[PDB]
Design a protein around this ligand. Structure first.
Ligand SMILES: CC(=O)N[C@@H]1[C@@H](O)[C@H](O[C@@H]2O[C@H](CO)[C@H](O)[C@H](O)[C@H]2O[C@@H]2O[C@@H](C)[C@@H](O)[C@@H](O)[C@@H]2O)[C@@H](CO)O[C@@H]1O
Ligand SMILES: CC(=O)N[C@@H]1[C@@H](O)[C@H](O[C@@H]2O[C@H](CO)[C@H](O)[C@H](O)[C@H]2O[C@@H]2O[C@@H](C)[C@@H](O)[C@@H](O)[C@@H]2O)[C@@H](CO)O[C@@H]1O
Ligand code: NA
Ligand code: NA
Ligand code: NA
Ligand code: NA
Ligand code: NA
Ligand code: NA
Ligand code: NA
Ligand code: NA
Ligand code: NA
Ligand code: NA
Ligand code: NA
Ligand code: NA
Ligand code: NA
Ligand code: NA
Lengths: 332, 332
């Protein structure tokens, strides 16, 4: 039974989201639909992505490292490799385990990119594993085409490149035809000033492998993401309730659900066109969430884009398989 | 009942340790005993530490930032504040939530410290939350006395300072009488070359608050830590099985246990002098673990210091309250 995949702690403060590893505190409806594959599992034990259900480090041992010009001090360091080159990843060779599923946001001049996935780390020496210590920085990671001269976003892994670019100047740039990337897998969001931005990533930024099924509304049932408060570079001190705005990141699944789906096969749980339904019991009122065979969650919220606060969620109880045709209750 | 605190996934690949957030893959006996309080809970709902049972970010908004000399390029950046100054931490004002419980390892010259807790981040501007972008680096964090001129390790929080020092040169140093620290809470271990070192932290490096109870052997029952593979700075690419050696970090508890202990009070579970016992069932053979009222785990391994491999652990079953006087079975 899927029932124990989603239990009370998962959405009441313990569970984190499968993209940012942030404590889930809201449900973000997506009336326009979305797709996600990375660190996302279905009910047949499979992922279309390239990441295990954990947050550790991003490591690839063979890419091109460079910086522009004849002066190496305080430069933007660029690392890139081809998607499909992660030979040492048994899940998928598309990208290193943990590489974020977000399209690259280009940046130049004095401009910090908006809504980039950013992680800390740097370049390392492919011949011995030692870091190039003068390249440690915050790096934007994403999928692109056209590197090195003009990396531009792409949202398919097919024909893509994986790119890392420091968002601030490194102490001393490194040019190496073969060099490694090391970045910690729990990210922050790039912003150019103190203001919070929209929930990140927006659907049109998410990178998906060929074959990834899409989540679309079914009647009044609308796909959701799981929202957590995520740090942002323009005001790195900001937390929940900041007067400069609260920043949300979102993921397609609670990580505890992803973990469970990755450990057992649930393919006999649902018949075609069913959700597995749970009831979310608030201090007053309740709502239902439905899980599809493809691993996406739904709420009965129709066209509403408004974040649903989970602070008054008390517990979760399983309902069972139900038709996706039936409107999920939303009675808060 | 404590029974569901420790279930099969906690030690068979899902659970991470409460110091490094690494996947637990071994049990490390500590025949000489140890103490731990940070991100450690007891069975009466309480911690002596200063950290919540999660890994997010370390943030303190008021410390002294400096570098030595009249040349600001490629310098070691130092940040320090007094222990007890974390006013915004409701768990404890000893230190910012997530600050590591390890004594500071001094370093100078061209020397990278051995066995330091290292995290990525930098200094930020107390007046607005914006990072000082030229200070991003890998930083050693620990407790010390004698900063700024001569920080030296301490293992009590009483009268201590909290220190962060970049282990590599920052692009441009910053001198500020009041400045913030931001460091991601999942660390790596500093090493000066490619070799793995002993499990980290060793008992004599762990920083404890006043009142913290110690774990000592009880008959043939010996306290243990939970070991995970942790990255090291001297060979940042090394993972499990590296020919340069496998590096372990250890924590006093599996994080899922810490979480459970922080959410409910278990003080009626055990009578004085009892362990709550679980049986660990391997492909062949079995052993018992016991949990004391103070939240420490024990195994019946006596004087053995050898890491116990969990790769062949299949499942866990609860036994119940038993006298700590009874030798925990070790029959692998
Ligand atoms: C020079 C100036 O005007 N600076 C302000 C800065 O002081 C503000 O910080 C907030 O101040 C209030 C009290 O006045 C509280 O102390 C808030 O906690 C604090 O906001 C927090 O810190 C700042 C630095 C940001 O990181 C913010 O995201 C945090 O929530 C800010 C915001 O009011 O405005 C100016 O920068
Ligand atoms: C120039 C040179 O001789 N370098 C070697 C380096 O190549 C070694 O790495 C190992 O090489 C074997 C094949 O010969 C495998 O490819 C290993 O995966 C590789 O070890 C891994 O990469 C190195 C860079 C380290 O990060 C190590 O921890 C990894 O496990 C190493 C070790 O044998 O020695 C020299 O540096
Ligand atoms: Na959970
Ligand atoms: Na990793
Ligand atoms: Na990988
Ligand atoms: Na660019
Ligand atoms: Na592809
Ligand atoms: Na740098
Ligand atoms: Na938004
Ligand atoms: Na677990
Ligand atoms: Na107590
Ligand atoms: Na935090
Ligand atoms: Na020092
Ligand atoms: Na103290
Ligand atoms: Na720097
Ligand atoms: Na050791």
């Amino acid at each position: 039974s899927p029932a124990d995949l989603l239990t009370t702690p998962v959405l009441t403060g313990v569970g984190t989201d499968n993209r940012w590893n942030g404590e889930i505190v809201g449900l973000q409806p997506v009336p326009g639909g979305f797709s996600t594959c990375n660190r996302h599992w279905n009910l047949n034990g499979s992922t279309f992505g390239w990441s295990s259900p954990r947050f550790a480090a991003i490591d690839h041992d063979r890419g091109n490292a460079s910086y522009p010009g004849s002066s190496s001090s305080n430069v933007l360091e660029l690392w890139y490799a081809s998607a499909g080159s992660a030979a040492d990843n048994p899940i998928s060779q598309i990208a290193p385990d943990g590489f974020p599923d977000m399209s690259f946001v280009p940046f130049s001049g004095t401009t910090v990119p908006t809504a980039g996935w950013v992680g800390f780390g740097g370049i390392w020496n492919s011949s011995n594993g030692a870091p190039f210590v003068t390249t440690v920085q915050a790096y934007e990671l994403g999928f692109a085409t056209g590197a090195p001269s003009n990396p531009q976003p792409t949202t398919t892994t097919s024909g893509a490149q994986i790119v890392a670019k420091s968002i601030y100047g490194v102490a001393t740039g490194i040019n190496q035809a073969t060099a490694g990337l090391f970045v910690m897998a729990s990210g922050v969001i790039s912003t150019p000033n103190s203001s919070a931005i929209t929930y990140t990533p927006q659907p049109n930024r998410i990178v998906n492998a060929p074959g990834t099924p899409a989540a679309a509304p079914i009647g009044k049932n609308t796909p959701i993401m799981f929202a957590s408060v995520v740090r942002r570079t323009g005001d790195i001190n900001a937390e929940a309730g900041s007067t400069n705005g609260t920043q949300y990141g979102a993921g397609s699944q609670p990580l505890p659900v992803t973990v469970g789906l990755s450990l057992n096969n649930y393919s006999s749980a649902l018949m075609p066109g069913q959700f597995f339904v749970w009831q979310l019991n608030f201090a007053s009122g309740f709502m239902e969430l439905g899980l599809s065979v493809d691993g996406y969650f739904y709420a009965g919220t129709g066209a509403s884009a408004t974040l649903i606060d989970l602070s008054e969620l008390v517990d979760i109880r399983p309902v069972g398989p139900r038709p996706s045709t039936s409107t999920l209750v939303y009675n808060l």
